[PDB]
Amino acid sequence: KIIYPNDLAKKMTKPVIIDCRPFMEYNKSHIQGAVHINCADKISRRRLQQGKITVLDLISCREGKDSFKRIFSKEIIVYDENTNEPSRVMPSQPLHIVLESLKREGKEPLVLKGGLSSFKQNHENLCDNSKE
């Protein structure tokens, strides 16, 4: 259920990547290609928590033809700002929300060990930073 930065780097060069930080952080900087899931907004937060909207949906509904089947086959990487151990993620954190939602949808997500903090250490090159 965990993956190391350098490990994520290899796969990024050889998977879906989901950013669980506040939208403002995401815009300042995030992993290239990463999708941001809104857990800040109550409507969105609740809707994801009540299983009314699926995370896979938020990703697939923006792509194409075999989008859904393809995503279900890929590995899903989810990352925080600096979380190290998933088992110790409080039920209130977006990371936990997105995580429970993915399991529910039938996928076994991987957590970026150390979050972005640890990733940007040697892979700032793989992040998109914004002009702001």
Swiss-Prot record:
Transmembrane segments: none annotated. Residues 15-128 form the Rhodanese domain. It comes from the Eukaryota. Residues 42-58 are annotated as: Interaction with MAP kinases. Expressed in keratinocytes (at protein level). Detected in brain. It is found in: Cytoplasm; Nucleus. Monomer. Interacts with MAPK14. Belongs to the protein-tyrosine phosphatase family. Non-receptor class dual specificity subfamily. Protein phosphatase involved in the inactivation of MAP kinases. Has a specificity for the MAPK11/MAPK12/MAPK13/MAPK14 subfamily. It preferably dephosphorylates p38. This is Dual specificity protein phosphatase 10. It comes from Homo sapiens (Human). The gene is DUSP10. The chain holds residues 148 to 287 of 482 of the full protein.
